[PDB]
């Protein structure tokens, strides 16, 4: 079993790489913006499965639970990553190093502007709280593990919570400020979940009306709905 500090370091070593994607040469259309964003998502999904497998305890769960967790959390985990990438750039969504979208560029995709505004507002909350790197790592793991072998899972989630509490304690703030910071970080989990629910409705519709074709792993996740 790991100490809180060691668990955090394990999460740090597990971080997935930044997928590279570029703008098309021609101006964005509804179809081409949806193509660039789903292509990004599908590649990230491959690395996400590898990340989850490195979270201590995950591969000891039943293979059924592993499927269920990833199936439930994937959009949330993508959005959390995006928000972290975007945290020091107000008005912008840093999908990848060469795909940095200004808020208004979403005007070309029907319905996406609402979701961009949710992601941007939640990102601003994390900015105002001064979310720290180690806190981000614990929260992202908590998203996976709370998305819902059973004894193992509640234990795993508790270990990650203990790790977050440990990180907050290291900041040196008062006992009541520590409780307050824990509450404020965790209250943002429901905003991430809300944005995921809305993003999933949007993408499912776009797929359904054949605005954008999706393949392989992303296709398989969407067909589950």
């Amino acid at each position: 079993a790991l100490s809180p500090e060691q668990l955090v370091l394990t999460l740090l070593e597990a971080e997935p790489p930044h997928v590279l994607i570029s703008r098309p040469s021609a101006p964005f259309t509804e179809a081409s913006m949806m193509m660039s964003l789903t292509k990004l998502a599908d590649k990230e999904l491959v690395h996400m499965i590898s990340w989850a497998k490195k979270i201590p305890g995950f591969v000891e769960l039943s293979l059924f639970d592993q499927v269920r967790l990833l199936e439930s959390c994937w959009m949330e985990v993508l959005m959390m990553g995006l928000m972290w990438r975007s945290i020091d750039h107000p008005g912008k969504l840093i999908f990848a190093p060469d795909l940095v979208l200004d808020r208004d560029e979403g005007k070309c995709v029907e319905g996406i502007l609402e979701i961009f505004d949710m992601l941007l507002a939640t990102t601003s909350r994390f900015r105002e709280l001064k979310l720290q790197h180690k806190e981000y790592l614990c929260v992202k793991a908590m998203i996976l593990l709370n998305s819902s072998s059973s004894r193992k899972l509640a234990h795993l989630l508790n270990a990650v919570t203990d790790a977050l509490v440990w990180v907050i304690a290291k900041s040196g703030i008062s006992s009541q400020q520590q409780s307050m910071r824990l509450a404020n970080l965790l209250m943002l989990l429901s905003h991430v979940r809300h944005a995921s629910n809305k993003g999933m409705e949007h993408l499912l519709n776009m797929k359904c009306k054949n605005v954008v074709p999706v393949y392989d792993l992303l296709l398989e996740m969407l067909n589950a709905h």
Binding site: V46, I49, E220, M221
Partner: peptide, 12 residues
């Protein structure tokens, strides 16, 4: 209904 995800989960 998860051939790919299972394969990624099991691959090394």
């Amino acid at each position: 209904r998860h051939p790919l995800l299972l394969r990624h989960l099991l691959q090394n």
